Ligand binder design. Structure first.
Ligand SMILES: [Zn+2]
Ligand SMILES: [Zn+2]
Ligand SMILES: [Zn+2]
Ligand SMILES: [Zn+2]
Ligand SMILES: [Zn+2]
Ligand SMILES: [Zn+2]
Ligand SMILES: [Zn+2]
Ligand SMILES: [Zn+2]
Ligand SMILES: [Zn+2]
Lengths: 80, 80, 80, 80
């Protein structure tokens, strides 16, 4: 209907575009160098430190592996 | 066929990439800080103020929740 | 296998990310202000002038309508 | 669970967003001008030189053709 139902504060501008995994866990990268995993309800599931801003938007494989690039030249494959 | 069928003026450059929800409602974020929801025919459905330019591109969950990040460091989950 | 099978010269850097329509027609926006439609084989189908660089990546609706934003503040809905 | 399972060093910041092909091969473009293809396990499959940074995110056609744009004004269609 357009009403907010939660925001989640990362550390920097979230330029990455978010992905939704087979279980509704939402994955997004932030300029704070972190890929965030938020449970569908708004509470963090985990965050993964890389070496630079995550402008890449996460891709999601069949087994649920999360694939995302980072300003630190690396393509990361992260277990769920 | 390539003919236009409507443009919709947001307030700033629309860098966000648009998403299409289970009902055809198209969701896009604009540098005017707004996530826009446009009914499939071109008339606004609603727009949601965040605190900065929305470069993130909206993700869309099973229940239709719209997930998008914003230059204001937050990941937003917005009801339809 | 990794061999090229065609490039298509737009007028400026293609930052937009390409979309594939129900018939294989590939849609991408270019900084030359144009959304390009390329037939699956590499020959243009059409290109649609907007008022600025198309950094947005095209979305594709059920009927095949192409939805994309542009640096000119507008969200465009373009017939196939 | 959030544990890493491999990073892959490209040559520059990976701004492109990665795509997953019908066989799990992950495709991403890097600012080093290369579109990378990584086998699902982390070892390269191949990398394709273009003429500029690949900010575009790869699209994937029915036959597995990889479609991506590049800062060198070209839209590339690359065999698997
Ligand atoms: Zn900030
Ligand atoms: Zn940094
Ligand atoms: Zn402007
Ligand atoms: Zn602002
Ligand atoms: Zn150039
Ligand atoms: Zn211009
Ligand atoms: Zn971008
Ligand atoms: Zn660097
Ligand atoms: Zn270069």
């Amino acid at each position: 209907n357009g009403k907010l139902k939660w925001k989640f504060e990362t550390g920097g501008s979230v330029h990455s575009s978010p992905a939704i995994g087979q279980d509704g866990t939402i994955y997004v990268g932030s300029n704070d160098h972190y890929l965030y995993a938020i449970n569908p309800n708004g509470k963090l599931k985990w965050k993964f430190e890389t070496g630079g801003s995550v402008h890449s938007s996460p891709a999601i494989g069949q087994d649920g592996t999360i694939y995302v690039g980072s300003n630190d030249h690396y393509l990361y494959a992260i277990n769920p």
